[PDB]
């Protein structure tokens, strides 16, 4: 979802 | 013409890598820990870690290995950077000095190469023929180790296999041999290759290519006695060698993915295994002997051992000690026992290191309404989640408050020969002395024997033999514990004032000018001894019996008065040793000595505020390390306080300072106090482990905080916080949070541990009915946190699959209430993007949380600022600007649709906005015309943004995907339709970190302009300020000069490090400065420092002062 996506790029690789 | 300055406020704290071995000595167990651009070196001992050398690098460490080739005494360090800087490192102690030296280096990137799936992997052969690297798909680089290869020249080799997963070299091998899991269509597979470097090919491996699972991800290489390879997947583990295939599928690892590992016993019967959960496993290899033959294996099993922080990095140390490098959470030191405790955990934590974790959002709020911001961050993820309140400075808590305009000193006073407690404080005064007998905690001023009331007191020590001392202008007096009267009284032969007092509990030394006596308070009387005169007026003296002598004190130090100087001497003799001839026309107001663990110390305050510092020798008497700090502007009175084991040095100045202890060094942190004139330890029954402290007018007493330039408070959330808001009227924080739960056998979701959402003091669920039509779900909450106690007052839980993505705290329209507003989103795996969500307006009351208003939307509300009494909100590539009715409802006014996906917004006082996901930035204005947006300008570069901020009307800051910062301003040029509809990338910089959040605020105070703070995935907190063109220039110059003087470490060019870089563009930095590099200046030797000037004017120490005024921006 790019949302999974944000949270993930968000907590790092 | 953009002019900005970046500095680090908190160094990264996440642990990306860590490695163990003998790097310092061949007998020595070292722990090596890689932060980002920071390298930590420890020596392992009985207690745990002895620190030794922390250095920085000009790259992000991506590979870190210790190794040893032939005829090499001890281990060498291999380091590879994310920008493909490679280097070899040697640990070098020049007796007392430490250097990490660069034995070899070069850059190994290629112009070709699409950077691979699973990032950089670097490996080293068991013999040390070479190093193998995997920077690119299709390719496999190789760097042969030799005596030469000093520039690490490498050939590449072609790999049939385009999607490699993990690789290592195999033990017990004829030729160099790699071994790897790669993926192709039909699944994943395992493969081998010798590496013959003579012809730089690959040749053929000793074992056929077998299959391995769909989720095979780790390759472990089992050392010589065993040989072979271990492959780890989900729910399963396997072993390969020759024709030998051993496999296990233990349901217990199925729960979550393994993710790190570590050899425990050199032979490798045992290895450690890290889960995404925090769980710690042991993997065991059951050996098997056959008589005159090498060891085989029979079986392997897995034992659950316990629970650590989420491990990135694992290293078995000494004897059941395990270091646990974490980045989602705090790093820690851990004990492994043969015996479980209760709960059945073989793991026991010994030490915990704080990681500011992934800082995910943050804000500034002067909790104690002070003028100093404290910073509050959402940190961590999952069970490590937390808040962290971050406070510059050592603070103290004020017990009494006595307005006393005068106080010119103060020493302890125990009204009793037994108890540690002192019920009196005698305080030198404006030419007088007053006494303070205490009814315990009650303040009361009376008289005392042999202690003058109309005469200033220069001292009060604590002389043994049941007697109390009062050195005055006139005469070193005496009073008893038995008699308590006029026991004795010294007087200067001709009736001349003592100028400068000093003594302990056994020793006495005064001075009259240059004149130096020496007396002793021998049983109930003052017996005299030595004498000497001095070149010039004695400014100050210090005596205190140090390590090897109780009471009776060895050598000494003194400050003179015309030549402005300090010098080393002895006891009854007064023989002059080495010295220092400090400059200026201002004298040394202070000069005392002290120690801590393993060093004796001399320091010397002057009256201009500045300070010179030196270490000493109880035996010899020599120089040390000449440097010159600044502290206050006023004289500085040095003292020493009861703390913990290492009772420390306090600096009395207009800017009160503590001097603690670093590596084995000495700390220099602010004291969060008005101003302090004099200060001493204390302990009354009414005021225990105290510290007296007098200023302009008023006595005070209290304990002390930790130390570190910063204090970090704590707040374990047990789940992962996401956004954070301060609503001051309600004195609380709103925090969006998320917990994971699992399907049931009712299908329904349960939970895995008690969170803050579930241990909440009270609670709501969302009721609202706007929508209609094992496994892991997120459950989202809005928390209400007391600003004082940090308790979850209330928790609101959202709808099933509602993710709460944005949060604000504003007043809207004419309405005089303050609301909490949460923008949300409905979320499913199947869907690409959400296509519905809501905005909910909320009020926290006495103890209540009322759903004030809802509003449906047709996508994700990624962000929302409050605009001008209106609410502005990004909603799936569609900006909207809502209005609050008088009827209390959110109604549309206008939109902008020119966005791929609007992620961030910010608002400049006026009617300006900015933001986007894969574009860069846009600016907009609101037009009080038709209540519309007019799209003023954009940036046409392909920046995958991650954070955004308005530095001001024209300067826009932006962070992105690739760890770069950049600044934008709108062109000021003719033809104002095309050139105006663009804004140029006027500032570029490579940070090396990934920025989740910008925001306005500061951590300091009650040259530069503004202050924007940022928090990063890694723990690092930076700060961005603005400059005058002039200041910029001076600093750019001085940056370039500074690079000549400093030796980096891989040899890395600083400017290569700082360069805007994407896997598609590379420019040098403009309009940005590391104070990080600037600040380096100060730690440079005056000689190397001299050089940095060959050339409005030219100086040498001006610049020292200029870096000073800077180090204090944070």
UniProtKB/Swiss-Prot annotation, chain A:
Disulfide bonds: none annotated. Coiled coil: none annotated. Interacts with DDB1 and CUL4A. May function as a substrate receptor for CUL4-DDB1 E3 ubiquitin-protein ligase complex. This is DDB1- and CUL4-associated factor 4. It comes from Homo sapiens. The lineage of its organism: Eukaryota, Metazoa, Chordata, Craniata, Vertebrata. The gene is DCAF4. The chain holds residues 124 to 136 of 495 of the full protein.
UniProtKB/Swiss-Prot annotation, chain B:
Residues 392-708 are annotated as: WD repeat beta-propeller B. GO terms for cellular component: chromosome, telomeric region; Cul4-RING E3 ubiquitin ligase complex; Cul4A-RING E3 ubiquitin ligase complex; Cul4B-RING E3 ubiquitin ligase complex; cytoplasm; extracellular exosome; extracellular space; nucleolus. The modification N6-acetyllysine is found at residue 1051. The modification Phosphothreonine is found at residue 1099. Residues 13-356 are annotated as: WD repeat beta-propeller A. Pathway: Protein modification; protein ubiquitination. Phosphorylated by ABL1. Ubiquitinated by CUL4A. Subsequently degraded by ubiquitin-dependent proteolysis. One of its GO terms (biological process) is DNA repair. Its main location: cytoplasm. Keywords: Acetylation, Biological rhythms, Cytoplasm, Disease variant, DNA damage, DNA repair, DNA-binding, Host-virus interaction, Intellectual disability, Isopeptide bond, Nucleus, Phosphoprotein, Repeat, Ubl conjugation, Ubl conjugation pathway. Residues 2-768 are annotated as: Interaction with CDT1. GO terms for molecular function: cullin family protein binding; damaged DNA binding; DNA binding; protein-containing complex binding; protein-macromolecule adaptor activity; ubiquitin ligase complex scaffold activity; WD40-repeat domain binding. InterPro entries: Beta-prop_RSE1/DDB1/CPSF1_1st, Cleavage/polyA-sp_fac_asu_C, RSE1/DDB1/CFT1/CPSF1, WD40/YVTN_repeat-like_dom_sf, WD40_repeat_dom_sf. It is found in: Cytoplasm; Nucleus. The modification N-acetylserine is found at residue 2. Residues 771-1114 are annotated as: Interaction with CDT1 and CUL4A. Residues 709-1027 are annotated as: WD repeat beta-propeller C. PANTHER family: DNA REPAIR/RNA PROCESSING CPSF FAMILY (PTHR10644). It is linked to White-Kernohan syndrome: An autosomal dominant disorder characterized by global developmental delay, variably impaired intellectual development, hypotonia, and characteristic facial features. Some patients may have genitourinary and skeletal abnormalities. Protein, which is both involved in DNA repair and protein ubiquitination, as part of the UV-DDB complex and DCX (DDB1-CUL4-X-box) complexes, respectively. Core component of the UV-DDB complex (UV-damaged DNA-binding protein complex), a complex that recognizes UV-induced DNA damage and recruit proteins of the nucleotide excision repair pathway (the NER pathway) to initiate DNA repair. The UV-DDB complex preferentially binds to cyclobutane pyrimidine dimers (CPD), 6-4 photoproducts (6-4 PP), apurinic sites and short mismatches. Belongs to the DDB1 family. The core of the protein consists of three WD40 beta-propeller domains. Component of the UV-DDB complex which includes DDB1 and DDB2; the heterodimer dimerizes to give rise to a heterotetramer when bound to damaged DNA. The UV-DDB complex interacts with monoubiquitinated histone H2A and binds to XPC via the DDB2 subunit. Component of numerous DCX (DDB1-CUL4-X-box) E3 ubiquitin-protein ligase complexes which consist of a core of DDB1, CUL4A or CUL4B and RBX1. DDB1 may recruit specific substrate targeting subunits to the DCX complex. This is DNA damage-binding protein 1. The gene is DDB1.
């Amino acid at each position: 979802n790019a949302s999974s996506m944000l949270r993930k790029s968000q907590l790092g690789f | 013409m953009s002019y900005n300055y970046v500095v680090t406020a908190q160094k990264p704290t996440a642990v990306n890598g860590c490695v163990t071995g003998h790097f310092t000595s061949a007998e020595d167990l070292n722990l090596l820990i890689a932060k980002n651009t920071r390298l930590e070196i420890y020596v392992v001992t009985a207690e745990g870690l002895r620190p030794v050398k922390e250095v920085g690098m000009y790259g992000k460490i991506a590979v870190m290995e210790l190794f040893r080739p032939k005829g090499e005494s001890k281990d060498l360090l291999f380091i590879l950077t994310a920008k493909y800087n490679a280097c070899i490192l040697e640990y070098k102690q020049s007796g007392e000095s430490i250097d990490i030296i660069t034995r070899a280096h070069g850059n190994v990137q290629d112009r070709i190469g699409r950077p691979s799936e699973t990032g950089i992997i670097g490996i080293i052969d068991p013999e040390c023929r070479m190093i193998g690297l995997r920077l690119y798909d299709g390719l496999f680089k190789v760097i042969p180790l030799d005596r030469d290869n000093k520039e690490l020249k490498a050939f590449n080799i072609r790999l049939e296999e385009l999607h490699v997963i993990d690789v290592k070299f195999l033990y017990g091998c004829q030729a160099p041999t790699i071994c790897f899991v790669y993926q192709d269509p039909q699944g994943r597979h395992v493969k081998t290759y010798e590496v013959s470097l003579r012809e730089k090919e690959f040749n053929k491996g000793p074992w056929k290519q077998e299959n391995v699972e769909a989720e095979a991800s780790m390759v472990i290489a089992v050392p010589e006695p065993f040989g072979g390879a271990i492959i780890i997947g989900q729910e399963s583990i396997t072993y390969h060698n020759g024709d030998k295939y051993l496999a296990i599928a233990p349901p217990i690892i199925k729960q979550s993915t393994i993710v790190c590992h570590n050899r425990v016993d050199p032979n490798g019967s045992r290895y450690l295994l890290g889960d995404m959960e925090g769980r710690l496993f042991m993997l065991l290899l059951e050996k098997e002997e056959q008589m005159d033959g090498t060891v085989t294996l029979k079986d392997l099993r897995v034992e659950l051992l316990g629970e650590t922080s989420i491990a990135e990095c694992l290293t078995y140390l000494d004897n059941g000690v395990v270091f646990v490098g974490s980045r989602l959470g705090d790093s820690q030191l851990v004990k492994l026992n043969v015996d479980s405790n209760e709960q059945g955990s073989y793991v026991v934590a010994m030490e915990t290191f704080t990681n500011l974790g992934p800082i995910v959002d943050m804000c500034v709020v002067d909790l104690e309404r002070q003028g100093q911001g404290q910073l509050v961050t959402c940190s961590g993820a999952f069970k490590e989640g937390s808040l962290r309140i971050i406070r510059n400075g050592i603070g103290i808590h004020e017990h009494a408050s006595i307005d006393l305009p005068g106080i010119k000193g103060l020493w302890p006073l125990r009204s009793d020969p037994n108890r540690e407690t002192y019920d009196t404080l005698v305080l030198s005064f404006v030419g007088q002395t007053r006494v303070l007998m205490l009814n315990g905690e009650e303040v009361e001023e009376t008289e005392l024997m042999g202690f003058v009331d109309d005469q200033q007191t220069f001292f009060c020590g604590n002389v043994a033999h049941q007697q109390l001392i009062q050195i005055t202008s006139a005469s070193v007096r005496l009073v008893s514990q038995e008699p308590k009267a006029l026991v004795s009284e010294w007087k200067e032969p001709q009736a001349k004032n003592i100028s400068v007092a000093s003594c302990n509990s056994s020793q006495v030394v005064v001075a009259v000018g240059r004149a130096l006596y020496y007396l002793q308070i021998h049983p109930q009387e003052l017996r005299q001894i030595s004498h000497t005169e001095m070149e010039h007026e004695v400014a100050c003296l210090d005596i205190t019996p140090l390590g090897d002598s109780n009471g009776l004190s060895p050598l000494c130090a003194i400050g003179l008065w015309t030549d402005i100087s300090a010098r080393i001497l002895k006891l009854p003799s007064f023989e002059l040793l080495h010295k220092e001839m400090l400059g200026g026309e201002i004298i040394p107001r202070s000069i005392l000595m002290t120690t801590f663990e393993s060093s004796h110390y001399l320091l010397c305050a002057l009256g201009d505020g500045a300070l010179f510092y030196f270490g000493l020798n109880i035996e010899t008497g020599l120089l040390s390390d000449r440097k010159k700090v600044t502290l206050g502007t006023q004289p500085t009175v040095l003292r020493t306080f009861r703390s913990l084991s290492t009772t420390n040095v306090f600096a009395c100045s207009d800017r009160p300072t503590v001097i603690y202890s670093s590596n084995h060094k000495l700390v220099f942190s602010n004291v969060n106090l008005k101003e302090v004139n004099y200060m001493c330890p204390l302990n009354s029954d009414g005021y225990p482990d105290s510290l007296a402290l007098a200023n302009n007018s008023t006595l005070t007493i209290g304990t002390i905080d930790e130390i570190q330039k910063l204090h970090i408070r704590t707040v374990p959330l047990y789940e992962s916080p996401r956004k954070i808001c301060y609503q001051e009227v309600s004195q609380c924080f709103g925090v969006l949070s998320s917990r994971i739960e699992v399907q049931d056998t009712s299908g329904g979701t349960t939970a895995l541990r008690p969170s803050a959402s579930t241990q909440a003091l009270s609670s709501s669920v969302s009721s609202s009915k706007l929508f209609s039509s094992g496994e892991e779900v997120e459950v989202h909450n809005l928390l209400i946190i007391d600003q004082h106690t940090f308790e979850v007052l209330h928790a609101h839980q959202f709808l099933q699959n509602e993710y709460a993505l944005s949060l604000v705290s504003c007043k809207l329209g004419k309405d005089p209430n303050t609301y909490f507003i949460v923008g949300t989103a409905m979320v499913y795996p199947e869907e690409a993007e959400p296509k519905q969500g809501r905005i909910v307006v909320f009020q926290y009351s006495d103890g209540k949380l009322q759903t004030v208003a809802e509003k449906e939307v047709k996508g994700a509300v990624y962000s929302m600022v409050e605009f001008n009494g209106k609410l502005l909100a990004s909603i799936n590539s569609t900006v909207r600007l809502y209005e609050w009715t008088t009827e209390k409802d959110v109604r549309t006014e206008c939109n902008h649709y020119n966005n791929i996906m609007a992620l961030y917004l910010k608002t400049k006082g006026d009617f300006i906005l900015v933001g986007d996901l894969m574009r860069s930035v846009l600016l907009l204005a609101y037009k009080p015309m038709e209540g519309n947006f007019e799209e003023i300008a954009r940036d046409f570069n392909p920046n995958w943004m991650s954070a955004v901020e308005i530095l001001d009307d024209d300067n826009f800051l932006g962070a992105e995907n690739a760890f770069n910062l950049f600044v934008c301003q709108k062109d000021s040029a003719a033809t104002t339709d095309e050139e105006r509809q663009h804004l140029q990338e006027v500032g570029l910089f490579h940070l090396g970190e990934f920025v989740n959040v910008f925001c306005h605020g500061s951590l300091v105070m009650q040259p530069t302009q503004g202050s924007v703070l940022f928090g990063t995935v890694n723990g690092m907190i930076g700060l961005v300020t603005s400059l005058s063109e002039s200041w910029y220039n001076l600093l750019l110059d001085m940056q370039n000069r500074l690079n000549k003087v400093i030796k980096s470490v891989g040899k890395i060019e600083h400017s290569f490090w700082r360069s805007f870089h994407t896997e598609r563009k590379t420019e040098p930095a403009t309009g940005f400065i590391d104070g990080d590099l600037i600040e380096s200046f100060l730690d440079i030797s005056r000689p190397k420092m001299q050089e940095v000037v060959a050339n409005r004017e030219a100086t040498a120490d001006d610049l020292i002062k200029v870096v000073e005024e800077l180090t204090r921006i944070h």
